[PDB]
Design an enzyme around this catalytic site. Structure first.
Site, PDB file in Angstrom:
ATOM      1  CB  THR A 122      -2.624  -1.393  -7.625  1.00 62.47           C
ATOM      2  OG1 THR A 122      -1.788  -1.746  -6.514  1.00 62.47           O
ATOM      3  CG2 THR A 122      -3.018  -2.666  -8.389  1.00 62.47           C
ATOM      4  CD  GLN A 123      -0.129   0.959 -12.635  1.00 65.73           C
ATOM      5  OE1 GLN A 123       0.172  -0.135 -12.160  1.00 65.73           O
ATOM      6  NE2 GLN A 123       0.759   1.754 -13.227  1.00 65.73           N
ATOM      7  CG  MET A 141       1.777  -0.323  -2.424  1.00 67.97           C
ATOM      8  SD  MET A 141       2.286  -2.004  -2.838  1.00 67.97           S
ATOM      9  CE  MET A 141       0.698  -2.800  -3.088  1.00 67.97           C
ATOM     10  CD  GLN A 168      -4.186  -5.280  -5.458  1.00 67.39           C
ATOM     11  OE1 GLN A 168      -5.325  -4.988  -5.831  1.00 67.39           O
ATOM     12  NE2 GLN A 168      -3.316  -4.367  -5.032  1.00 67.39           N
ATOM     13  CG  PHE A 169       1.724  -4.069  -7.883  1.00 67.03           C
ATOM     14  CD1 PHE A 169       2.584  -4.687  -8.779  1.00 67.03           C
ATOM     15  CD2 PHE A 169       2.262  -3.255  -6.895  1.00 67.03           C
ATOM     16  CE1 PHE A 169       3.954  -4.499  -8.692  1.00 67.03           C
ATOM     17  CE2 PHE A 169       3.630  -3.061  -6.803  1.00 67.03           C
ATOM     18  CZ  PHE A 169       4.478  -3.684  -7.704  1.00 67.03           C
TER      19      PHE A 169
END
Ligand SMILES: *[B]([O])([O])[C]([C][C]([C])[C])[N]C(=O)[C]([C]C1=[C][C]=[C][C]=[C]1)[N]C(=O)C1=[C]N=[C][C]=N1
Ligand SMILES: [Mg+2]
Lengths: 250, 212, 233, 222, 240, 244, 231, 235
Positions: free
Chosen positions: C1-2, C107, D1-2
């Site tokens: 995640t970024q 992710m 957040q992804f």
């Protein structure tokens, strides 16, 4: 690739002999003579600087090595094997002791660690034994002065005095006559120089002889002041000049 | 969900409802909540539909492998413990299972084990599991005896599910009955609650609250 | 995640009778700051495919290197690398689509929306979309970001369904794209006047146009607008 | 957040006839309030007379269908070109879905075809692999609109026979392929009217012993 | 890791390392197993070359795997400990998961499986051990007696012997043991077991160990005097 | 490849013997003799240092007798370096048992553990076995005073009196002749020294060629004391028994 | 002699005997023939039986809808290699939506077999393969040897007595290459080619095995009464 | 010494060929396939009369529709059987169906060549895998340690194999009944066995579609032996 030699290269022969250890001892026999003598107030270790060429600077090659401030070592046999042992011996003195107890190990325990390393090379997979015998001189607070021999097998014995290598048989006989329990350090150094002269053929002087002592604390060699409990290293390597001075009174 | 199972003179009765929900949405009314592990073992499912099917279907594979290796059918105790040990490995991961492992063997007799996704494993005579378990318990406890006829025991189990199907919003659809004996389990049909309710109300004289 | 840092805005595209058109402005935004004014976001692969990329620019540059490497690898032990076994738009897309979905599944996504425009061996138009989630879809018109909201409506007035494609010429299609780019400059706060446009035709091949500008803008009516209600002066 | 999941909308519908089966689905693909495509095929022929659709998050849907099609291929290689029966396919799909139990394929899967007795079969799945053979099933966004209509018009629920007044139920007569397609088309027209994610086009795949046939119908594009 | 294939086939289709492991068993002290009608007895030889031994603490030849199963052996003593330990662990593991103690057949099958695994695993030699596994299944009064060997094969025996001079005692048992009517009592079974060892043992003093296993976890080891009484009675009847 | 140079340390001979174990035992047969004698009120450990020198520092030397814990000690016969590896493992094992159960490790359990390690080197790994035989002298509250021996095969046995190393055949005959069950520590001390004195390959048995130790309940009340004899103490007991 | 103990040892003349011994296993194997035109590619294989009660060992394996091979030698090794091809063909489809080129499939087999000839511990593959396929550059036929050498050919044969069929194809080269849009005549030429390698035994119904792939023809295998037409 | 996966100059794996010699020393096992079922029979060959012969398990169930007989180093077969049983059950779990006999056999044969320097040597046992499925009907396979498997109408393995195979050559036809096959196995076993054939030193089994795989009782086999003696004395 991968190290596929996961089996022992040292094994018992029908006669019960461990061939590679015996052969390693033969390699030690061919090696240059080195000796150790224990006095009441110190220990001396010595050996000949057998220069491979006169163009080679024999000062750069150190046969006598500091392991801890109070422990020194010398050898007979294969120099490269000795060099790596010293590196491992110095490191194990820190990792397995000083970083735990906050102090340098006593002579016998450091010897025990060195011995362990040499034993493993005698049993582990894909390796030959070390082709050296070590003479480790040292001091610690509770055991005092001590001198130990360490063989390719990993076996180690404490000595009052001894010799290893080329002319060890004759040298040990010479030491048996001269040694007593009331020797001072200077007397031991004197005997060390006499004993070593017998095994040396060519030039015999401070530049061709390497000699160190485990003796009194050297606060001048410590490098700092301000801590009373730190009094300096007991290991000291004698200079070329310091050897020659004692060769005049020989 | 409402599932029950109880030991009695004529072996074991197993009864379950048929409803599956996703929130307030009724996802299915025709769910098979009894799993035929072998001709002598039954498993009830409650909680997460996939967790229960997958692992109880899997349990039957483990029980089959046991009797191939040991030349002897698996015990109810061993079968239940395989499942309970498995879910215990996954404890904390979020499995949602409430099950009864019901069966008969020579050495054990009729046996019921409550197995749980928290790792709980309990032997017992009576169990009710699911969101509508409390409703089933009410009917079951007030009418239970060891000396019940196969016919009467079956009705009690059927009636206990009906009671829960009525009150519990997340239970309903239809009632699946099973009867486990010395000679294996026997299926006793799918009973739609939409027809069973009015039948029971009229014949039994119960549910006088409701108008019909 | 970024989180995306340096970003590219809308990529717009459409099919026409003999091929596909794709366009995207030359801006690399840094939040509200219009940081980099010379960024090429259309990247040709061979002479039959153009990949238009929006979103994170660092990830775009990574994808750019993957495609460059894909051409090299395809040429290895391939005597027909410039003929029958040359890279197809469908091959290039599916590769990206595989990567995008794999990365989202770990992710750790490539924070992009990608449109692969090109022409196949048999002359068929190729136009398909893929994004950070690995979501894919095809349509006579495709657009990313603000383009989806503003460009598509305009482009769909030209090609509303599949049967309109043979009726649409390259001049009409290009005109619609250029108009859409102007509209985006009026209304997208993270767009620039300068843009690139690429045409992949089955007859005339790949035409790559750089340093285009939005022109024929209407601003004169602004002088008549005074205050926010009651003000007259 | 992804957020690794999305919602591509759409709706699917499977109905099992006496010697046939249908699997229908709208062709609209969306995100939020935007249309991505008006024609993006959602129901696929997977070989061995099986049709499949994984409605919900399209990326997971495409991944699953792709992996099942792959499973059919390797079933032929490993088992001497044996035909994968619909019941075996259903169990295989359970293991695909439950394989990702702790990071699920966010889809409502439906497959349709014929069982080994030649009768029509529809199997329905939840996202984590729980499955069940059914005569009738709608899935996806507008499933809540369509399923009740099917309970009524396919299984004749709450319907009784005139004159008897609640005593005798309406008999469960079988439905022909022409009768089913009418119910499918009306289901989707109704769903399109009241659900914003449903529209553009309807694509139906019909499975019989003769093979897999397709039918397409326009839907409202607003 | 050491991966060298030590157990391999030869041109004549023999695995010599397994066959040489049997020769180690042949060298080992004699062990015998005899099952009666309601009991099993395990006899074991103790070579009298070793005197000045401490018989309290010296590892006994018969080992309990569980409260209802026992294991004796012939061959390498050090190797036998590894099999016994594994077996003992598996016995408790079985009770833990199945909620029932192992059957004598199951325990045998496990031990035999371990031995087999060592005949086709890299870097390991086979076990130089053959075992006699005896006992009674849970809630069962039928006696059980099984044998295993380095190759990994196992089988059930009415009576069996292994180790040095096993050929002789097997000869004795084959003529003396009747299947239609086995040793009805504990006495008769122990007597026949001692008799069979007396064909080989030398002296009947401390050279014979006897262990009687009965149903429902009833295991007991006979003392020197108890065994000596059997030795006395056998020879007195023989003088005729 | 590497197979060419593999000695294959863990294989059977046609006769069913382990080559390396047998050859390791041959190695041990040339090592200095070590004797253990168990009595009713204690255990004796006696051992002969091999052809020493006058310049060997004896008081700080230890090649034969080692301490495993406060209750257990061992006499070594074979390669000293090999023995120390096993000794350090055994010392750790005793401490692990003490940490786990809060009770001193039973002698047999410790002995079994070391014997199992030795066994491992004969069955797998492709390494040479440890050329070492131990005499374990220890005490616990279950069996009391215990003597054990282990050899490179990993096989161990219990003893009343036992020898390892050189001249064990001659030594065992002499022990078997003069040993009795009702014997005491002081008598066992004398037997041990007398046995070494006859079996020794040296011209005469002296204090500098010996290591000696006793495990006595001869400690203030119900407890056990280990005594590793000093050079001067060995010299005194040699005069007391009438050997020098 | 002294240099055949393992695959990692060159002989003094620069030979790899373990590879050559693996090559020998192919010559012991039953004959199989491969040949192609511009439109189609055909495999013809003589299956071998253990005895009259036994079945006839299958010689042809399918790798994809557009590719497959025939084997001669150790059948389990052919199963390993064919399984590897299946995966590579499948990887190309799933990732690139692209049917694997036959030339590239040969390159992959070459490199897989090579690793086994240079490393210690392993062994060469004991099987030869004839790969046929139809890709974007038309019909193809490859010959795989477990040394690693892969060769694209118009026609060939491997196995016992394969020299007879290979000579026949060498004469017929100009004829069978021109058999375009006619599968039955291309198979006939293949059946007539493999017949040159027969002695004593002849082509029966359960003996013969034929496969074909082409322009509008998926890779399909013919056995049993399906090949009675060509006997 | 030499590699385990070494080829001979003739192009054969030494270890595979040597394991085949071990199988020749093994006890005889015979399988006969018919349209009414497949029969499996084995020589027990007890090394001593004290050995309880019923504990000799050389015929084994893999699934309800698949049986298996063995010959050679029978200890090696245990892991092969365990793999077979697992493969059979696992496939039923994944596909809700019985597994094909050929597919089961192929799964077993995949283990065969997984030896090197994985296990340290090939298996020293040959298997006769008999079974039934809906696609190919009643089937008999011979699974070797080479990784190869042949299907057979009838097959003998073990010490008396070539003599028995020659006898099966003449006797087998496509219209054999199950009863005829049972007697035929008993006839050929009796011929090649050292000791005299009876119900205690020889075992029968079969696999039918209806009843599945069944090992025959000693009472049932004894009648078939008595039925054999009379029919041979009849002419
Ligand atoms: B029951 O209510 O526990 C029931 C049993 C299950 C086997 C169908 N569970 C469910 O209906 C659950 C939701 C739930 C409701 C109340 C308590 C616990 C759980 N539903 C599902 O598992 C499910 C599966 N697929 C689709 C929709 N819902
Ligand atoms: Mg709508």
């Amino acid at each position: 690739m991968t190290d596929r030699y996961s089996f022992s290269l040292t094994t018992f022969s029908p006669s019960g002999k461990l061939g590679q250890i015996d052969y390693a001892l033969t390699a030690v026999k061919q090696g240059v003579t080195s000796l150790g003598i224990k006095a009441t107030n110190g220990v001396v270790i010595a050996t000949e600087k057998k220069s491979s060429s006169p163009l080679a600077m024999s000062e750069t090659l150190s046969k006598v090595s500091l392991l801890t401030p109070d422990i020194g070592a010398v050898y007979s046999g294969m120099g490269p094997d000795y060099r790596v042992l010293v590196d491992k011996s110095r490191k194990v003195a820190h990792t397995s002791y000083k970083r735990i107890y906050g102090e340098y190990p006593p002579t016998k325990l450091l010897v025990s660690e060195v011995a362990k390393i040499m034993q493993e090379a005698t049993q582990s997979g894909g390796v030959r034994p070390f082709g050296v015998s070590l003479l480790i001189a040292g001091h610690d607070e509770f055991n005092g002065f001590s001198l130990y021999q360490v063989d390719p097998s990993g076996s180690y014995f404490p000595w009052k005095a001894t010799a290893i290598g080329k002319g060890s048989v004759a040298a040990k006989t010479f030491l048996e006559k001269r040694w007593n329990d009331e020797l001072e350090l200077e007397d031991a150094i004197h005997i060390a120089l006499l004993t070593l002269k017998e095994s040396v053929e060519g030039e015999f002087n401070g530049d061709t002889i390497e000699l160190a002592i485990i003796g009194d604390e050297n606060p001048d060699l410590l490098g700092y002041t301000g801590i009373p409990t730190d009094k300096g290293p007991r290991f000291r390597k004698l200079t070329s000049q310091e050897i020659n001075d004692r060769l005049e009174a020989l | 969900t409402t599932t029950l199972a109880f030991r009695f003179q004529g072996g074991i009765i197993v009864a379950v409802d048929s409803r599956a929900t996703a929130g307030n949405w009724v996802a299915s009314q025709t769910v098979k909540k009894v799993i035929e592990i072998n001709p002598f073992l039954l498993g009830t499912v409650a909680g997460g539909a996939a967790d229960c099917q997958f692992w109880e279907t899997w349990l039957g594979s483990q029980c089959r492998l046991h009797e191939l290796r040991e030349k002897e059918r698996i015990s109810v105790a061993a079968a239940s413990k395989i499942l309970s040990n498995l879910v215990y490995q996954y404890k904390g991961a979020g499995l949602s299972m409430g099950t009864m492992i019901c069966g008969y063997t020579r050495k054990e007799g009729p046996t019921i084990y409550y197995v749980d996704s928290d790792g709980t494993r309990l032997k017992g005579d009576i169990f009710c599991v699911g969101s509508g378990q409390t409703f089933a318990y009410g009917v079951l406890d007030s009418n239970y005896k060891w000396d019940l006829s196969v016919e009467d025991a079956l009705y009690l189990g059927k009636r206990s599910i009906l009671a829960a199907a009525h009150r519990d919003a997340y239970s309903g659809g239809s009632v699946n009955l099973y009867h486990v004996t010395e000679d294996g389990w026997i299926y006793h049909g799918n009973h739609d609650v939409g027809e069973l309710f009015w039948k029971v109300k009229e014949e039994e004289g119960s549910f006088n609250n409701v108008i019909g | 995640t970024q989180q995306p840092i340096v970003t590219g805005t809308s990529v717009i595209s459409m099919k026409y009778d003999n091929g596909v058109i794709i366009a995207a402005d030359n801006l690399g935004s840094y939040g509200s700051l219009l940081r980099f004014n010379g960024v090429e976001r259309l990247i040709p692969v061979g002479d039959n495919t153009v990949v238009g990329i929006s979103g994170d620019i660092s990830d775009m540059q990574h994808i750019e290197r993957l495609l460059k490497d894909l051409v090299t690898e395809n040429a290895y032990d391939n005597p027909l690398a410039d003929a029958e076994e040359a890279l197809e738009p469908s091959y290039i897309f599916e590769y990206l689509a595989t990567v995008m979905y794999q990365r989202r599944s770990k992710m750790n996504p490539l924070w992009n929306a990608i449109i692969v425009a090109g022409v196949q061996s048999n002359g068929d138009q190729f136009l398909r979309y893929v994004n950070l989630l690995g979501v894919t879809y095809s349509s006579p018109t495709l657009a990313t970001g603000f383009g989806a909201h503003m460009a598509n409506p305009l482009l769909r007035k030209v090609v509303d369904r599949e049967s309109d494609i043979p009726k649409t010429t390259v001049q009409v299609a290009e005109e619609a794209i250029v108009n859409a780019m102007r509209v985006l400059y009026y209304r997208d706060a993270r767009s620039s006047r300068n843009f690139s446009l690429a045409i992949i035709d089955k007859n005339t091949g790949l035409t790559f146009k750089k340093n285009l500008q939005v022109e024929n803008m209407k601003w004169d009516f602004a002088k008549d607008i005074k205050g926010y209600g009651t003000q007259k002066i | 957040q992804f957020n690794p999941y999305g919602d591509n909308g759409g709706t699917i519908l499977g109905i099992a006839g006496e010697d046939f089966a249908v699997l229908a689905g709208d062709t609209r693909n969306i995100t939020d309030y935007s249309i991505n495509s008006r024609y993006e095929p959602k129901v696929f022929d997977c070989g061995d007379n099986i049709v499949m659709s994984a409605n919900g998050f399209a990326a997971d849907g495409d991944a699953l269908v792709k992996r099942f099609k792959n499973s059919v291929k390797w079933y032929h290689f490993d088992h001497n070109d044996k035909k994968l029966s619909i019941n075996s396919a259903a169990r295989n799909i359970q293991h695909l879905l439950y394989g990702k139990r702790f990071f699920p394929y966010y889809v409502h899967t439906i497959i349709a075809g014929l069982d080994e007795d030649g009768k029509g079969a529809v199997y329905s799945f939840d996202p984590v692999g729980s499955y069940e053979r059914e005569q009738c099933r709608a899935g996806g966004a507008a499933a809540s609109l369509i399923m009740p209509f099917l309970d009524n018009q396919v299984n004749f629920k709450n319907q009784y026979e005139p004159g008897t007044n609640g005593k005798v139920k309406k008999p469960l007569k079988y439905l022909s392929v022409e009768e089913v397609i009418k119910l499918v088309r009306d289901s989707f027209t109704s769903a399109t009217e009241r659900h914003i994610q449903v529209g553009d086009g309807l694509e139906i795949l019909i499975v019989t012993k003769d093979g897999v046939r397709k039918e397409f119908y326009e839907l409202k594009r607003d | 890791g050491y991966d060298r294939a030590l157990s391999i086939f030869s041109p004549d289709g023999h695995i010599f390392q397994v066959e040489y492991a049997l020769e180690a068993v042949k060298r080992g002290t004699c062990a015998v197993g005899v099952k009666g009608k309601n009991c099993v007895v395990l006899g074991c030889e103790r070579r009298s070359t070793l005197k000045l031994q401490d018989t309290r603490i010296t590892p006994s030849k018969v080992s309990k795997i569980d409260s209802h199963v026992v294991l004796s052996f012939s061959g390498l003593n050090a190797d036998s400990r590894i099999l016994i330990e594994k077996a003992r662990v598996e016995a408790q593991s079985h009770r833990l998961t199945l909620e029932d103690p192992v059957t004598v057949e199951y325990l045998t099958r496990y031990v035999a499986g371990v031995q087999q695994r060592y005949t086709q695993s890299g870097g390991v030699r086979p076990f130089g051990v053959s075992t006699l596994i005896a006992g009674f299944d849970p809630r069962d009064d039928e006696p059980k007696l099984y044998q295993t060997e380095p190759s990994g094969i196992y089988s059930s025996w009415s009576a069996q012997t292994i180790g040095r001079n096993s050929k002789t005692v097997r000869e004795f048992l084959e003529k003396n043991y009747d299947r239609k009517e086995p040793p009805a009592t504990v006495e008769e079974c122990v007597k026949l077991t001692v008799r069979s060892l007396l064909e080989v043992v030398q002296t009947g003093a401390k050279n014979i160990e006897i262990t009687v296993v009965k149903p429902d976890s009833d295991i007991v080891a006979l003392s020197s005097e108890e065994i000596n009484q059997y030795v006395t009675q056998i020879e007195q009847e023989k003088q005729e | 490849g590497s197979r060419r140079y593999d000695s294959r340390t863990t294989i059977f001979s046609p006769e069913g013997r382990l080559y390396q174990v047998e050859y390791a035992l041959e190695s041990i047969s040339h090592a200095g003799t070590a004797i253990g004698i168990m009595a009713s009120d204690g255990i004796v450990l006696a051992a002969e240092r091999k052809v020493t020198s006058t310049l060997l520092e004896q008081d700080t030397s230890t090649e034969k007798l080692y301490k495993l814990n406060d209750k257990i000690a061992v006499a070594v016969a074979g390669l000293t370096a090999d023995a120390e590896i096993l000794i350090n493992t055994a010392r750790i094992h005793a401490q692990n048992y003490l940490k786990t159960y809060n009770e001193d490790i039973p002698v047999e359990i410790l002995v079994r553990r070391l014997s199992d390690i030795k066994q491992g080197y004969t069955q797998h790994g492709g390494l040479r076995p440890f050329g070492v035989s131990f005499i374990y002298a220890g005490y616990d509250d279950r069996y009391g005073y215990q003597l054990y021996t282990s050899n490179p095969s990993g096989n161990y046995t219990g003893w009343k009196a036992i020898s390892v190393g050189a001249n064990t055949s001659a030594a065992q005959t002499l022990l078997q002749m003069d040993y009795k069950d009702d014997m005491k520590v002081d008598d066992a001390i004398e037997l041990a020294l007398k046995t070494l004195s006859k079996t020794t390959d040296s011209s005469a048995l002296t204090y500098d060629r010996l290591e000696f130790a006793t495990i006595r309940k001869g400690a203030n009340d119900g407890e056990v004391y280990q005594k590793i004899f000093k050079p001067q103490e060995i010299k005194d007991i040699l005069v007391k028994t009438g050997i020098t | 002699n002294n240099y055949d103990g393992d695959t990692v040892t060159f002989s003094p003349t620069g030979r790899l005997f373990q590879v050559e011994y693996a090559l020998e296993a192919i010559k012991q194997g039953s004959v199989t023939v491969g040949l192609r035109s511009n439109t189609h590619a055909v495999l013809v294989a003589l299956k071998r039986n253990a005895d009259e009660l036994s079945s006839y060992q299958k010689k042809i394996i399918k790798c994809d809808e557009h590719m497959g091979l025939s084997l001669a030698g150790l059948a389990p090794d052919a199963r390993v290699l064919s399984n590897y091809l299946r995966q590579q063909c499948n990887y190309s489809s799933l990732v690139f939506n692209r049917k694997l080129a036959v030339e590239r499939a040969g390159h992959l087999l070459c490199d897989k077999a090579q690793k086994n000839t240079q490393s210690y511990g392993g062994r060469p593959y004991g099987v030869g393969l004839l790969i046929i396929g139809y890709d974007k550059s038309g019909a193809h036929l490859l010959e795989f040897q477990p040394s690693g050498n892969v060769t694209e050919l118009y026609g060939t044969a491997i196995g016992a007595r394969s020299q007879g069929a290979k000579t026949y194809l060498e004469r017929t080269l100009d004829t069978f290459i021109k058999i375009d849009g006619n599968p039955d005549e291309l198979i006939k030429a293949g059946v007539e080619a493999i017949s040159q390698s027969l002695r004593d035994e002849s082509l029966t119904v359960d003996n013969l095995s034929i496969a074909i792939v082409g322009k509008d023809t998926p890779f399909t295998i013919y056995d049993g009464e399906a090949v009675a037409k060509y006997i | 010494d030499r590699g385990v996966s070494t080829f001979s100059p003739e192009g054969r794996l030494f270890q595979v060929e040597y394991s085949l010699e071990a199988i020749k020393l093994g006890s005889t096992a015979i399988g006969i396939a018919t349209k009414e079922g497949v029969v499996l029979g084995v020589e027990k060959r007890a090394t001593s009369p004290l050995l309880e012969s019923d504990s000799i398990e050389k015929i084994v169930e893999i699934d309800r529709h698949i049986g298996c007989a063995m010959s050679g180093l029978t200890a090696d077969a245990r892991s092969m059987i365990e793999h077979a049983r697992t493969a059979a059950v696992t496939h039923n779990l994944y596909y809700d169906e019985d597994i094909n006999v050929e597919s089961l056999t192929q799964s077993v044969c995949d283990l065969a060549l997984r030896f090197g320097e994985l296990m340290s040597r090939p298996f020293g046992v040959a298997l006769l895998i008999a079974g039934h499925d809906a696609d190919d009907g009643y089937q008999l396979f011979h699974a070797e340690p080479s990784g190869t498997f042949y299907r057979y109408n009838a097959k003998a393995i073990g010490s008396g194999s070539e003599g028995a195979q020659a006898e099966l050559l003449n006797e087998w036809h496509s219209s054999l009944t199950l009863k005829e096959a049972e007697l035929l196995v008993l006839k050929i076993l009796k011929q090649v066995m050292e000791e005299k054939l009876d119900e205690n030193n020889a075992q029968l089994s079969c696999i039918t579609k209806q009843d599945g795989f069944k090992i025959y009782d000693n009472e049932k086999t004894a009648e078939l032996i008595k039925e054999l003696k009379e029919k041979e004395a009849a002419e």
